[PDB]
Paper text:
The large superfamily of labdane-related diterpenoids is defined by the cyclization of linear geranylgeranyl pyrophosphate (GGPP), catalyzed by copalyl diphosphate synthases (CPSs) to form the basic decalin core, the copalyl diphosphates (CPPs). Here, we used X-ray crystallography and cryo-EM methods to describe different oligomeric structures of a syn-copalyl diphosphate synthase from Oryza sativa (OsCyc1), and provided a cryo-EM structure of OsCyc1D367A mutant in complex with the substrate GGPP. The structure of monomer OsCyc1 consists of an αβγ domain and a catalytic center located between the β and γ domains. OsCyc1 catalyzes GGPP to form syn-CPP, in which new bonds form between C6 and C11, as well as between C10 and C15.
To investigate the substrate binding mode, GGPP was incubated with OsCyc1D367A before cryo-EM sample preparation. We solved the cryo-EM structure of the OsCyc1D367A mutant in complex with substrate GGPP at a resolution of 4 Å. As exemplified by hexamer protomer B, GGPP harbors a continuous and clear density in the active site. We found that while the overall architecture of OsCyc1D367A is similar to that of wild-type OsCyc1, a number of differences exist around the active site, mainly in the loop near residue N405 and helix α7. In the OsCyc1D367A structure, the α7 helix and loops near residues D192 and N405 embrace GGPP more compactly. In the structure of OsCyc1, K233, N405 and K453 interacts with the pyrophosphate, while M194 and E199 are close to the pyrophosphate of GGPP. In OsCyc1D367A structure, the DXDD motif and the conserved basic amino acid, asparagine (N414), are situated at the terminus of the isoprene tail of GGPP. The distance between the d2-oxygen atom in D365 and the carbon-20 atom in the isoprene tail of GGPP is 2.59 Å. However, in the OsCyc1D367A structure, GGPP adopts a linear conformation, possibly reflecting the stage of binding, which might not represent the cyclization state. When we analyzed the structure of OsCyc1D367A, we found that the isoprene tail of GGPP is surrounded by negative and hydrophobic residues.
Numbering used by the authors:
A (entry chain D): 80 to 767
B (entry chain F): 80 to 544, 551 to 767
C (entry chain E): 621 to 767
Write the structure that this text describes.
């Protein structure tokens, strides 16, 4: 209702270093630090105090809801090792060893893509650590040989040389390596003092060196969580970006327009020229944050340059990190493709190759049935991918994408593959879905009511002596194409206005087209504009737009040009009239901006009309492709002129131009049955 | 019982093509159409089964609940001509032959003004086809040469060339027609594919040429009813309009304010520039349907134009149809006259001619006992014509009309006149009477209680500065009679009573300047709530100021009294003009000015009539108030404005109250009073 | 102005076969046009302003109708008594109007009442002067230069 929005706003306004669930493996690998002052107990006893009081009832560890083999294996092995080390509470070690020796046989059916990070470098070293002690585990298994093979396969890609010169993604699993030149290795850690934001690697480096900053980092992260250490920390850039994305794509962002603008400032202030990262102080970058951050920063009206994507190119084939084994990355390529739609004409041509390669890869993977990701499971990835691929930026009305996205949300059923299965909470929650569903239903009620009212008005004004042979379909189409863009609660005076004027235009057009031009007409047509209910501010200045449109009709007769441009211009003018928004033409740049926007809209609509006409008559594909490119150029220019921030015009005017062009461009890329299915799914298909 | 209301609502909102009875003539005529492949008997067995299934005790056919003559003999002969043609159930065939041979002597005593459709063109052909089979006919009888003469007159008025260039009313009875020359006549039938929506004629046309559309129509219409074929089908426009009329005239219209709109929608969606007869197909628009749809549409706030009614104008005479070989009935003319009241000033003079021609017509036929109609059979049509001619729209309160009519509804005994006799089920029922009587009794008891409730307060208020209480409350209740409007009704009455009291006091004391007491405080005697405490006092002070300013002049103060009474109605209930525009101010000002002017004019008329002057000044003032009432009525029920409907109806209520006061005699007023609020029902 | 002119024309076509003059409608049109050009609304929420406006409009309409009737009966071959009757009634209505206008405890604005008064006084003035005096005044007011 409304207290949920308050709870969400409170959770947003106090964001910090990031929230993430704890993990038993890291706690076990941290507890092994013998005391500094010379005592007998471990340095951090809170780790043992927690690890002893969080054992699963089955006798295992790891995540409870989901169930994956490697997670349980690693967590349980780490826990038994941490227990046997200090040799306390030895009543449960056998309870875990039973599970291990009973379920290690079933380690042969796990998928190839779901391989935990640092798995082939942490499982063998942990097994060797177990071998030092007398622990009976089935070391023999046909599956373990695959692990030792993958280990060498990965180690071949990163020699002993580049590990000591350039910081790579390898430092996230360091305890599984020996013979380390610690002299030329202390010069590569993060700014905080931890090796690539990983408590296990910091712990390993501490007990094998005499550093002091790593101890400070470990003590801080231990004290902040009152016992227990997380899988990765901090996340001060990941959470912000993905929370803003999940709030935007869900259709609830309008209530939080005072925090999102204060949440993206932190990202904009740290725009490293070679790309973003997963935090503020990580020296290795990647693509799942550069593309997403860039798109989000550009969609809200900032000044970002896209040439930073050039760093991730290698012989016309992108990647996600500096050196990996299996290039099965669906989310990074998907986010890059989605960020390759926003594109200004003057930008560097790298985005073209980005779009081409990402579309080729995603289409390849969609042909087969390999729609599985290596970072996080979800409820429905193929749905998101198919929607983002089949309906480009030109013809994606926001309300439709929201209605479709109210199904593929994970809620609490999501989990992200790190060093171990760990749950995120700040943007994988339950208030989001419920609030979105409530708001959607509250919108649908008003939509139905105003639809009934408009139907009565359409019947009473005897305006069915014109129009097609099925007026209900025309009314439904021309109201859905208006209630899908201006979807707010207090803009009925614009929604209904758009609907009424669209109906009037589509009636007069048919009446003119069934007679044979404007010369052979005899009725008074200028008076049809009086059917709109009277007012003082709105009407009176609308008959001017109507008379101008009628002059445009009577002036384009001896030629052969279309008329759709002037209809789009009438629609944008009539939407500007309602709402009461002027433009201070006192200064010139606003006047010039307005003129350019109007001309671009008219030209785009005319080109689209020509496309539809020349495609109906059954011509070759070359003409259609040429017209498509010719349209896309001006569409890119209009997008650039609408999203940027140079001239001083009320943002709602340019957004109105964008809405009108989006509608006119969407109505020409779908068959009637599809738009009917969409009308049925958006309005009538009730929620909760 | 309230449950009856929900029952009739559920039976109405699931309406279809109308539920009428079945006719023996049509079933018999359609039964004798033989099959195509092989043909071991007739085509449809359900029709012959129903025929052998529903014999009357006398042996005849038709609805014996109303013993007519013509339809019975016609149906019996046309049924025997098939029951003895297929040679089955012979033991009952001659049983009806004895009936006709023993009762044919009644055709010399039957009424002339009630002759069935196509009688004189279907009876001779029936005798022709009955000649062949072994059966006895009394050929020689003057009652047959008479119908032969009528047939000759009909063929004299209707030549043969009309049956090949334009649709014509003859196509309902194609039995007594030969040499049709279907070459051009087949493309002249209706849009559905029938022949003027008459199954007998379609069967006769399909027998002589193998058309598929007529076959499909007959198959659908026979499989719809599952046995039996109606006299005419469909009836999806006639039934709706007449049902809405008989529903709004009883006085239970306020309950069904949704289905009435969703029923007039289907009328407004088919207002062709010619008219609407009984379906969207039959192109023979007559003037008994238009005169109904036009009036109803203009009453409920729509946009219609009466220039269409001009299409029936022929040298001052008005045609019921294109080829009527008979002086028209009263019901189409009665409906035209009743629809010639809601005239707007900018309308064409077509109504101005109907209003006088139909008045003359209905006055001639009323000056005798010639009140028999032609397309209906009812209890008392002359009484309702009398009522509609005695009290015009200017002085016709709803309660008086519904009370005087509630004892005239035909219940379930209203037979109609087509090719055969049939009965309607939707708007000829007994549930309507039950619900209307229950609601009227509830209203009567409420009024009988509140009258004494008001009289006690009047006696307690010490306002003898009589008989006006009962008349005032009757005038207050004859318009706002809804269940939960006592708050407005009592306010209507109290202010009028106090007003006439102070009006008598000022006249007695000799001017409002020789008054030594204060009078503004008199408003405290009327009950009040906290939400409206001083507004009514402000209006009262405004009325007193208008009086002390309109003294020593000629214009009466009654107009300001009407305006004060309207504002008083407006206070009780609490609805504003809260929207806020320039048109709203202008509409309110215009309505108030019109009300005041009409009230003052009626005051002057009632003053100048008693004086015994010439009868021409009365005619002048009557034409003036008519020219004003037309515009006022237009502004009241236009339905295209932004003023709350009740705030608009208040002005009409007050003006009609004043007009009824000024256009009646005291004894008739008292008769209406003790017939409405004193004499109970049932 | 569109709506005001439409209403005036409808009032023309609604009184085409009556013996009443149509000067009141033109006076109401002029008053509405002045009020529109000035840019002054009227608070239609509370009842007293509505009633005051209705009373003022009815008064000015009746006054202008009476003036038109007197002007018609003047030049025609009528006696010198009916004119005095009409003048007495006109004066009564005018004194009631100036009572309603010059008062100080009213709730409507000040300029609107003065607009009503200006229109009514313009009509009553143009009704009471031969064209020669009108020409003299025109020449003396805006053409005869003062200093
Ligand atoms: C940056 C994005 C999109 C998400 C961040 C979420 C996290 C915690 C990512 C882990 C950060 C990190 C350093 C991962 C590297 C782990 C690893 C095993 C690197 C080397 O092997 P890969 O080729 O990446 O994967 P495999 O080990 O399964 O082959
Ligand atoms: C008009 C109302 C209230 C209901 C309509 C009911 C319908 C559809 C009746 C059938 C319409 C129809 C075909 C009428 C035939 C008109 C006609 C010329 C009949 C021939 O008889 P008349 O010339 O009237 O003379 P008699 O009927 O007295 O013989």
């Amino acid at each position: 209702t409304t207290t949920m929005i308050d709870g969400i706003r409170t959770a947003l306004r106090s964001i910090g270093e990031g929230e993430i669930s704890i993990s038993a493996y890291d706690t076990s690998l941290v507890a092994l630090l013998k005391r500094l002052d010379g005592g007998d107990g471990p340095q951090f006893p809170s780790t043992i105090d927690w690890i002893v009081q969080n054992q699963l009832p089955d006798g295992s560890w790891g995540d409870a809801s989901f169930f994956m083999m490697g997670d349980r294996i690693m967590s349980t092995l780490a826990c038994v090792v941490a227990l046997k080390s200090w040799n306390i509470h030895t009543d449960k070690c056998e309870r875990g060893l039973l599970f291990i020796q009973e379920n290690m046989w079933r380690l042969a059916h796990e998928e190839e893509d779901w391989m935990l990070v640092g798995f082939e470098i942490a499982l063998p070293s942990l097994l060797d650590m177990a071998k030092d002690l007398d622990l009976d585990i089935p070391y023999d298994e046909p599956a373990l040989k695959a692990i030792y093979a993958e280990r060498e396969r990965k180690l071949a890609k990163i020699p002993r040389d580049v590990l000591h010169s350039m910081p790579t993604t390898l430092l996230h699993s360091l305890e599984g390596m020996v013979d380390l030149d610690w002299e030329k290795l202390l010069k590569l850690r993060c700014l905080d003092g931890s090796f690539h934001c990983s408590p296990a690697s910091t712990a390993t480096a501490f007990q094998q060196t005499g550093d002091q900053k790593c101890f400070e980092y470990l003590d801080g992260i231990v004290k902040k969580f009152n016992g227990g250490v997380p899988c990765i920390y901090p996340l001060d850039v990941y959470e912000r970006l993905w929370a803003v994305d999940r709030l935007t794509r869900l259709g609830i962002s309008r209530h939080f327009t005072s925090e999102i603008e204060d949440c993206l400032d932190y990202i904009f202030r740290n725009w490293t020229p070679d790309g973003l990262a997963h935090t503020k102080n990580c020296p290795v970058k990647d693509i799942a944050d550069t593309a997403m951050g860039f798109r989000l920063l550009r969609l809200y009206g900032y000044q970002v340059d896209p040439c930073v994507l050039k760093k991730f190119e290698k012989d016309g084939k992108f990647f996600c990190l500096h050196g990996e084994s299996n290039p099965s990355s669906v989310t990074p390529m998907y986010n890059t493709y989605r960020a390759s739609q926003l594109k200004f004409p003057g930008d560097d041509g790298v985005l073209g190759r980005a779009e081409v390669f990402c579309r080729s890869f995603l289409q390849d993977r969609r042909g087969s049935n390999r729609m599985k990701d290596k970072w996080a499971i979800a409820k429905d990835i193929p749905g998101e991918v198919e929607y983002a691929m089949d309906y480009p930026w030109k013809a994606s009305l926001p309300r439709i994408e929201t209605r479709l996205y109210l199904d593929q949300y994970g809620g609490s059923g999501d989990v992200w593959i790190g060093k171990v299965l760990h749950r995120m909470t700040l943007f994988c929650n339950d208030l989001y879905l419920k609030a979105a569903k409530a708001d959607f239903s509250n919108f649908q009620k008003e939509c139905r009511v105003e639809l009934n009212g408009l139907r009565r008005w359409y019947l009473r004004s005897n305006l069915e002596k014109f129009g097609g042979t099925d007026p209900q379909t025309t009314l439904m189409t021309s109201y859905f194409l208006a209630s899908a863009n201006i979807f707010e609660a207090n803009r009925a005076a614009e929604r209904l206005g758009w609907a009424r004027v669209a109906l009037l235009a589509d009636a007069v057009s048919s009446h003119f087209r069934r007679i044979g031009g404007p010369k052979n007409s005899t009725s008074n047509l200028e008076e049809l504009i009086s059917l709109v209910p009277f007012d003082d501010a709105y009407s009176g200045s609308l008959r001017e737009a109507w008379k101008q449109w009628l002059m445009a009709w009577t002036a384009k007769e001896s030629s052969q040009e279309s008329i759709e441009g002037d209809t789009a211009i009438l629609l944008v003018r009539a939407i500007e009239i309602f709402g009461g928004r002027h433009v201070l033409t006192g200064q010139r740049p606003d006047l010039w901006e307005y003129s350019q926007l109007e001309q671009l809209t008219s030209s785009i609509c005319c080109k689209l009309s020509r496309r539809v006409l020349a495609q109906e008559n059954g011509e070759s594909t070359e003409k259609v492709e040429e017209i498509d490119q010719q349209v896309d150029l001006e569409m890119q220019e209009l997008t650039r002129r609408v999203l940027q921030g140079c001239s001083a015009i009320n943002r709602l005017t340019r957004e109105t131009f964008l809405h009108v062009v989006k509608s006119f461009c969407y109505v020409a890329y779908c068959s009637p049955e599809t738009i009917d299915s969409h009308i049925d799914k958006v309005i009538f298909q009730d929620v909760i």
